[PDB]
Scaffold this motif. Structure first.
Motif, PDB file in Angstrom:
ATOM      1  N   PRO A 294      -2.956  11.104  12.704  1.00 23.00           N
ATOM      2  CA  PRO A 294      -4.246  11.339  12.011  1.00 23.00           C
ATOM      3  C   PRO A 294      -4.385  11.999  10.985  1.00 23.00           C
ATOM      4  N   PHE A 295      -4.870  11.744   9.995  1.00 24.67           N
ATOM      5  CA  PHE A 295      -5.465  12.087   9.037  1.00 24.67           C
ATOM      6  C   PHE A 295      -6.135  13.819   9.353  1.00 24.67           C
TER       7      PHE A 295
ATOM      8  N   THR B 247       1.054   4.102  -2.962  1.00 24.04           N
ATOM      9  CA  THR B 247       0.644   5.217  -2.693  1.00 24.04           C
ATOM     10  C   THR B 247       1.484   6.189  -3.190  1.00 24.04           C
TER      11      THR B 247
ATOM     12  N   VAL C 292      -0.731  10.044   0.434  1.00 25.31           N
ATOM     13  CA  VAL C 292      -0.416   9.897   1.294  1.00 25.31           C
ATOM     14  C   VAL C 292      -1.254   8.780   1.673  1.00 25.31           C
ATOM     15  N   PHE C 293      -0.910   7.020   2.108  1.00 27.62           N
ATOM     16  CA  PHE C 293      -1.921   6.120   2.424  1.00 27.62           C
ATOM     17  C   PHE C 293      -2.824   6.476   4.041  1.00 27.62           C
ATOM     18  N   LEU C 294      -3.716   6.244   3.877  1.00 30.07           N
ATOM     19  CA  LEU C 294      -4.313   6.149   5.457  1.00 30.07           C
ATOM     20  C   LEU C 294      -4.491   4.758   5.838  1.00 30.07           C
ATOM     21  N   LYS C 295      -5.014   5.069   6.611  1.00 27.48           N
ATOM     22  CA  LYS C 295      -6.038   3.766   7.814  1.00 27.48           C
ATOM     23  C   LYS C 295      -5.727   3.286   8.763  1.00 27.48           C
ATOM     24  N   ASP C 296      -7.405   3.380   9.672  1.00 26.61           N
ATOM     25  CA  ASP C 296      -7.943   2.893  10.204  1.00 26.61           C
ATOM     26  C   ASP C 296      -7.945   4.347  11.361  1.00 26.61           C
ATOM     27  N   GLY C 297      -8.066   6.046  10.112  1.00 26.80           N
ATOM     28  CA  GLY C 297      -8.409   7.327  11.029  1.00 26.80           C
ATOM     29  C   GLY C 297      -6.529   7.699  11.265  1.00 26.80           C
TER      30      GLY C 297
ATOM     31  N   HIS D 141      -3.879   4.153  -6.681  1.00 31.70           N
ATOM     32  CA  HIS D 141      -3.555   4.724  -4.841  1.00 31.70           C
ATOM     33  C   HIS D 141      -4.285   3.355  -4.576  1.00 31.70           C
ATOM     34  N   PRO D 142      -3.483   3.331  -3.478  1.00 34.68           N
ATOM     35  CA  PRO D 142      -4.685   1.493  -2.784  1.00 34.68           C
ATOM     36  C   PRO D 142      -5.862   1.601  -2.413  1.00 34.68           C
TER      37      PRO D 142
ATOM     38  N   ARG E 124     -13.967   1.939   7.373  1.00 32.70           N
ATOM     39  CA  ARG E 124     -13.668   1.281   8.437  1.00 32.70           C
ATOM     40  C   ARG E 124     -12.157   0.861   8.459  1.00 32.70           C
ATOM     41  N   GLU E 125     -11.949   0.367   7.344  1.00 31.27           N
ATOM     42  CA  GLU E 125     -10.190  -0.445   7.007  1.00 31.27           C
ATOM     43  C   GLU E 125      -9.267   0.926   6.597  1.00 31.27           C
ATOM     44  N   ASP E 126      -9.776   2.097   6.734  1.00 24.64           N
ATOM     45  CA  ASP E 126      -9.508   3.697   6.385  1.00 24.64           C
ATOM     46  C   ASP E 126      -9.739   4.345   7.301  1.00 24.64           C
ATOM     47  N   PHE E 127     -10.507   4.738   7.958  1.00 22.82           N
ATOM     48  CA  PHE E 127     -11.178   6.416   8.226  1.00 22.82           C
ATOM     49  C   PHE E 127     -11.000   5.968  10.685  1.00 22.82           C
ATOM     50  N   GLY E 128     -10.836   4.898  10.703  1.00 21.74           N
ATOM     51  CA  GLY E 128     -10.941   4.453  11.807  1.00 21.74           C
ATOM     52  C   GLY E 128     -12.076   4.483  12.167  1.00 21.74           C
TER      53      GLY E 128
ATOM     54  N   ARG F 285     -14.940  12.024  15.762  1.00 25.32           N
ATOM     55  CA  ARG F 285     -14.477  12.523  15.032  1.00 25.32           C
ATOM     56  C   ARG F 285     -14.840  13.427  14.431  1.00 25.32           C
TER      57      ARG F 285
ATOM     58  N   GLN G 194       0.557  -1.254   0.151  1.00 25.92           N
ATOM     59  CA  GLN G 194       0.113   0.042  -0.046  1.00 25.92           C
ATOM     60  C   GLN G 194       0.860   0.955   0.143  1.00 25.92           C
TER      61      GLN G 194
END
Ligand code: SF4
Lengths: 428, 336
Positions: free
Chosen positions: A182-183, A152, A195-200, B173-174, B112-116, B138, A148
């Motif tokens: 955090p984003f 990116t 930039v890659f993001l993952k779970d916030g 993008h992933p 879910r897998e991205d933004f928390g 948030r 990932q």
């Protein structure tokens, strides 16, 4: 502090060639190096802003500020004099520009540009060395999230490190680290999918994050410096310095328009009196003509509309073409050595010989009486105490503060053009 | 409004506390209406008797600066209209419902897998759409700029014209790669067979040809949905010979991927998302033109499942679904 303590302090604080300039300085400096260092850093800032105003690109900015680095402000040279030079000069600048929000904005932008250029200038090892001394994700989190992050960052590496080859990108991506935040702090990079993001959590294009963090901290520090200004204002050795360094950074308007209230509503007293004389006598003397001409150039009148207006005010054409056309075109630099003569300031205008009968040039806060000045101020709907304040400013030989006074009451300025500029900006 | 709308569940959902709070006292109801409790909520809704009432942001004052409002997404079939044959105009069925199902799947995967984000549910729009409500702390206080950022992350399809090649950034993008590896297997079974919009030659030239890069291949295919899909590759391999086959094949792969995205990718609403102040129809509201209940959407939900205008009525399962969601939201609020 003894020279050893300051030596160790700057060794610790400049372990990396780069720092966000966090703490106040520690030492004493003779005023001459104060001025030399301030002037060097300010001139480099001025050149960088000149480069950006014309939309020059990154590498040419690097190339053009390279010699001023090589001459004025040495970099990546281990001389402790260089280091303290740069540090002291920067914090003096923080003293300088902290006075107004426009100036604070420009200073933060420009010093962050300096950060940018210095960063791209540095080496990879020392880049990461500054970055180290905001969490680097572990090598395990890197390997788990390998595909990932590669996906990116591959495009950014292509466009920013001329890594056209894929193998070079893999090799440098193996060397590259990644940060977790955090984003909400890198939403700008998020918008472009840089930039890659993952779970916030955003994995960071890290240079933009470093630069904007530096810029925000700089803005906060600068506001704080303005807050504490009065506790240095007793330093009679620096207020001239800070004023000098602050001033160191300093058709709709058509021939028919300059008589309209929408255009002359922003004028200072000098230009208003010059318009009055030109309307009344249908002629001025050399000093008034030059003052008014260079002013009207500074506000942005075209050369042909300038000829139009000046010719109109004289209610023969033969004598005009004989004597005045050449002088007016010389004023715009459109003759002779091709020097577009920059407008006279309040200082240069005051440096002119004093006006007499038939003259209207100068600074009317000087050349008029308190009687005429006060009657004109009353015509401007000013209060009584305002009139006492303006006349008190005038009596002390301080014409410019009276000018900025009347500005702030009818809406530091020692330039009629910037007077008009701020006045128009208040309406825009 | 007298009997069937579950005011207590909605109040507890939007109050963010068992006790009434400024999250409910200072929120707008559509303009500029607010209630202080369940009882006044019921009294005012019954007295006004609106066709539907919309949820506003939480403010500092009783409705004026917006403090919080849950991140939302609205999706409507209109942006997918050029790609179906099961329904026409404003009709809906499980064949066109697969579009919203896939879109919700993609968006939930991202969130879910991205933004928390964890506490998000989907609300049926009444006729043909689904509304997302992300009630994590948030997202509720998310600023306008960062709401623009999250939207611009989610909506890859920014050009809703079906007559143009998207020309997407390469390589993906992933999240794009994840969305495609999700949607690709479904694309055949839905678009090539069940809808089959490219069987018509005019719809074919209007939609399947502009998505390609090569004018020569376009014209060859023109003179010449699963059949046409295979013919594209066949005539591509036929027309492109030499050492330069590889780039053309790769870009044909990429164009086909772009078209699969254009057909099955989330095409959200871009204005309900941007500003926190904006309004959206509250859940369990009634659509005045159809009479359905804007019931919460689960994985197997279909438009025919939505009841038409209480514990033994068909509304109750959706009520219990909302009950479970609100309880989880309150426990997560206590955790935060
Ligand atoms: S102080 Fe300077 S700007 Fe002000 S009126 Fe006098 S000459 Fe003009």
């Amino acid at each position: 502090s003894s020279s050893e303590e300051e030596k160790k302090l700057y060794a610790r604080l400049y372990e990396s060639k780069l720092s966000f300039y966090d703490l106040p300085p520690q030492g004493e400096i003779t005023l001459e190096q104060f001025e030399i260092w301030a002037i060097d850093r300010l001139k480099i800032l001025l050149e960088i802003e000149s480069c950006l105003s014309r939309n020059k690109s990154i590498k040419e900015i690097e190339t053009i500020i390279k010699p001023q680095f090589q001459k004025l402000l040495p970099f990546n040279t281990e001389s402790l004099e260089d280091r303290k030079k740069d540090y002291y000069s920067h914090f003096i600048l923080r003293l300088c520009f902290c006075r107004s929000k426009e100036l604070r904005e420009k200073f933060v932008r420009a010093e962050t540009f300096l950060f940018k250029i210095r960063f791209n200038m540095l080496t990879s090892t020392d880049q990461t060395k500054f970055v180290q001394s905001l969490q680097f994700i572990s090598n395990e989190e890197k390997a788990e999230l390998s595909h990932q992050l590669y996906q990116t960052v591959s495009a950014s590496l292509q466009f920013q490190l001329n890594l056209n080859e894929e193998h070079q990108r893999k090799q440098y991506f193996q060397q590259e680290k990644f940060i977790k935040l955090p984003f909400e702090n890198v939403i700008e990079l998020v918008g472009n999918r840089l930039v890659f993001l993952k779970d916030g959590y955003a994995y960071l294009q890290q240079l933009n994050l470093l630069s904007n963090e530096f810029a925000s901290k700089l803005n906060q520090e600068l506001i704080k410096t303005y807050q504490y200004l009065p506790r240095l204002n007793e330093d009679d050795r620096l207020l001239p310095i800070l004023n000098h360094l602050s001033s160191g950074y300093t058709d709709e308007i058509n021939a028919q328009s300059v008589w309209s209230e929408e255009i002359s509503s922003n004028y200072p007293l000098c230009i208003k009196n010059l318009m009055e004389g030109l309307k009344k006598n249908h002629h001025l003397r050399y000093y008034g003509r030059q003052q008014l001409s260079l002013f009207l150039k500074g506000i942005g009148l075209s050369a042909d509309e300038a000829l139009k207006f000046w010719s109109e005010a004289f209610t023969t054409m033969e004598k005009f073409n004989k004597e005045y056309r050449y002088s007016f075109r010389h004023n715009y630099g459109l003759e002779g050595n091709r020097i577009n003569y920059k407008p006279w300031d309040c200082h240069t205008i005051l440096s002119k010989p004093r006006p007499g009968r038939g003259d209207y040039h100068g600074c009317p806060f000087r050349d008029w009486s308190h009687e005429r000045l006060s009657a004109e101020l009353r015509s401007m709907k000013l209060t009584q105490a305002q009139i006492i304040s303006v006349l008190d400013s005038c009596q002390k030989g301080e014409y410019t503060i009276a000018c900025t006074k009347v500005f702030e009451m009818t809406h530091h300025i020692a330039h009629p053009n910037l007077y008009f500029e701020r006045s128009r900006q208040l309406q825009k | 409004y007298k009997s069937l709308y579950p005011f207590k569940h909605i109040f507890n959902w939007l109050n963010h506390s068992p006790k009434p709070s400024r999250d409910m006292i200072n929120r707008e109801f559509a303009r500029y209406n607010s209630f202080n409790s369940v009882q006044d909520f019921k009294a005012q809704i019954e007295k006004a008797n609106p066709d539907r009432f919309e949820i506003g942001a939480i403010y500092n004052k009783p409705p004026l600066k917006a403090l919080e409002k849950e991140l939302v997404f609205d999706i409507d079939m209109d942006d997918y209209d050029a790609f179906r044959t099961c329904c026409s105009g404003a009709q809906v069925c499980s064949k066109c419902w697969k579009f919203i199902s896939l879109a919700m799947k993609i968006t939930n995967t991202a969130l879910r897998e991205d933004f928390g984000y964890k506490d998000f549910i989907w609300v049926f729009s009444g006729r043909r759409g689904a509304h997302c409500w992300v009630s994590d702390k948030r997202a509720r206080a998310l600023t306008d700029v960062q709401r623009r950022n999250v939207l611009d992350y989610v909506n890859v399809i920014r050009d809703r014209n079906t007559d143009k090649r998207l020309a997407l950034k390469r390589p993906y993008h992933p999240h794009l790669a994840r969305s495609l590896e999700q949607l690709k297997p479904f694309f055949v079974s839905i678009m090539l067979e069940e809808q089959n919009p490219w069987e018509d030659d005019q719809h074919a030239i209007q939609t399947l040809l502009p998505a390609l890069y090569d004018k020569q291949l376009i014209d060859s295919l023109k003179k010449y949905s699963k059949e046409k899909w295979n013919d594209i590759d066949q005539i591509a391999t036929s027309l492109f010979k030499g050492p330069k086959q590889d780039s053309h094949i790769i870009k044909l792969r990429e164009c086909k991927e772009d078209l699969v995205l254009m057909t099955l990718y989330p095409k959200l609403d871009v204005e309900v998302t941007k500003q926190t102040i904006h309004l959206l129809k509250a859940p369990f509201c009634i659509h005045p033109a159809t009479g359905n209940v804007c019931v919460p959407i689960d994985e197997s939900f279909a438009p025919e499942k939505a009841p038409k205008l209480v514990s033994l009525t068909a509304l109750q399962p959706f009520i219990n679904q909302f009950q479970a969601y609100v309880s989880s939201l309150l426990k997560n609020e206590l955790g935060s």
